[PDB]
Design a protein around this ligand. Sequence first.
Ligand SMILES: Nc1ncnc2c1ncn2[C@@H]1O[C@H](COP(=O)(O)OP(=O)(O)O)[C@@H](O)[C@H]1O
Ligand SMILES: [Mg+2]
Length: 337
Amino acid sequence: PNWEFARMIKEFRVTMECSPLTVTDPIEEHRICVCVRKRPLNKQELAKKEIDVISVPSKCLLLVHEPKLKVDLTKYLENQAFCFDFAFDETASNEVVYRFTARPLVQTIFEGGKATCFAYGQTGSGKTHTMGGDLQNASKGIYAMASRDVFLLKNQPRYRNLNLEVYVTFFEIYNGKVFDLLNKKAKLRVLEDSRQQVQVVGLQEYLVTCADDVIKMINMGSACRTSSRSHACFQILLRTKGRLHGKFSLVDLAGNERGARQTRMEGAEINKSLLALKECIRALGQFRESKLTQVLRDSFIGENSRTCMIAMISPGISSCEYTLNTLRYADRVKELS
Ligand SMILES: Nc1ncnc2c1ncn2[C@@H]1O[C@H](COP(=O)(O)OP(=O)(O)O)[C@@H](O)[C@H]1O
Ligand SMILES: [Mg+2]
């Protein structure tokens, strides 16, 4: 047969119908969740008469109206379809996006589980807008939202007898070097031991109690950081006896369009890490180690470990080549599940 094609086709088909009952399902463990989010064209983009070339006709489908010239100059479209677990159009808010990406994973930490949620995509696409908050608005972004609901889940009966402390970290990863955003960008050192386990020495874990505390911390970190070229990782830890119960690492990745002049070849580092991250993620469905995947190594290797990739799309015509690139990385992540 042509079975590889048949398999790829099936995988497409299956994803193309899904209810929101599939990721949020009990008793099936959707370990890997891949999403896409089209942001609207902004006024500068409108001002430059940019054509919106992206459509999101269903919850599980996204279309690229790839503009093309035939050899004889004749204009046409190659309308390309991609399907994801969720696809959010230019109307979907952060709270809506949060509801189907990260929120499901909150419970995983209170179940003694590890969680990761990545914002992936080109620069100016909305990674920080989604994760940090409206570009700022710490409270209108996933970091905060996840936290809001971490506190809510502790006050429920089922999870009150755990005697939990809520800790919080926040750091930047830039050219192989970690920097604590809660400790004045202090350059930290990353140690692997014999067991191949990682420690980020001197990474400050602030205890928190209310959501507003966390909003304060997120704003300190974001402030004490000054765009792309660097990863940002905000973590939420639940400790019981100062022993770690569960961990949610929320990451605002770097610009994915730097496959690379001379010596601004941080784009080498950025590339290695994104390639790394991809491989790591696909190991959570069963190399070239980067500082990012090293620091997050526990959050993939685990038994109850879950993840969520949110691919950000810039809808402009001028961005199409970058958009198509973003979508292939995303396709290639879903590929194993
Ligand atoms: N879904 C959206 N709705 C409205 N504005 C958005 C949206 N996504 C991004 N933006 C705006 O676009 C700009 C670029 O977003 P940003 O998240 O900083 O890009 P990047 O993810 O590359 O860092 C910001 O001003 C942000 O407020
Ligand atoms: Mg941003």
